[PDB]
Subunit: 115 residues, 4 copies
């Protein structure tokens, strides 16, 4: 599990469950091609998106559908979604944990990278 | 205005208005003595808390009554209040802006020193 | 000034100066078309990006070149850039302030609509 | 483990290791009495601070010595420490995860509360 996404709800103080996440990889033609997708679990985590064999060097985009999440709770959010764009494995394989802390009009995203 | 406090509401995307703020300075006996207080304005800001003459080197505590703010909106918050404790260095012309971004179960505080 | 962008540096506790910002509007063909751009000032702010006449309802993308900012300071950042995508509602007098608090491996973005 | 503290470093993108944490409980005389303390592990987490039997209703203060952490890295931080004050178990026993994301001049703290 070289890529893990964790989403938390800062309004309710709980994991953000059933949040849709789409991952893309920048293609040679500067186009974003679908790479993997899924929904966060009851723990607010999404595991098994890819394997170290498939997760090669490149630029990736993790899109978190925050809008749908807030609408389901009856809250009109500001952002359409949260995006995290980064270069991965440029100096060798690494393990990435992408966390997003969500509020209707604000979100923070942090990355923890290990070997 | 060497010290300014700004409070924002991350739930509504607006300044946090009428938020009580208390500032304390640590006394020689390690006790927190009242220094200044006020409530944020319609812009979520609190100016005029002190003067450069009064704002001497020391350890200060800025307490933001976040609990009362959320209760007024009908939301049960997690924290009793938000606290920012820092040392005023006083090494060259310096203005301190303390900002707090509030959510019911989370808050971030940032300091911009210029 | 219906749209304003503010960028702060959480590592140095100061405004993030000379940060390139590009704004895009989603076109009818779902394509991102250039809308406005500029660089933050000494106060970390970027004003005058557009006018209320030009700023019509739609989906906008604000791209902040955070990578170049950190590289100039000798720090290898995680993100390529920071993106804020939102819908301008245009339902009553509304000013949008988009703020981004930057750290090498983390950033937060908040919107204050007044 | 009704109380867990997690500390992350937003500058290096890693867990904040060996961070001193002191927990206090407000006494009947409005005084902060020592409750528990420890240091974060290699994962940036601190477990085993207390038990559900000892963790009774009350107001608690979790103090994170962020200043020492940054000084060890050669960075002059703004805050003396990070404090999190909250009422716990007022409506029954709950599990609390207190997370702190650290930067030299900024920090965010979030709480995830479960049953
Ligand atoms: O001015 C706004 O509209 C504004 C909006 C959202 C967040 C911040 C703002 O000013 C600051 C400062 C600051 O001014 O020092 C510091 C941290 C966060 C913010």
């Amino acid at each position: 599990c070289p890529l893990m996404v964790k989403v938390l709800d800062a309004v309710r103080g709980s994991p953000a469950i059933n949040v849709a996440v789409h991952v893309f990889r920048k293609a040679a033609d500067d186009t974003w091609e679908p790479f993997a997708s899924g929904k966060t679990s009851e723990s607010g985590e999404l595991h098994g998106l890819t394997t170290e064999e498939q997760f090669v060097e490149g630029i990736y985009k993790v899109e978190i559908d925050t809008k749908s999440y807030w609408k389901a709770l009856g809250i009109s959010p500001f952002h359409e979604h949260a995006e995290v764009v980064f270069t991965a494995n440029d100096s060798g394989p690494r393990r990435y944990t992408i966390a997003a802390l969500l509020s209707p009009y604000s979100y923070s995203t942090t990355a923890v990278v290990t070997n």
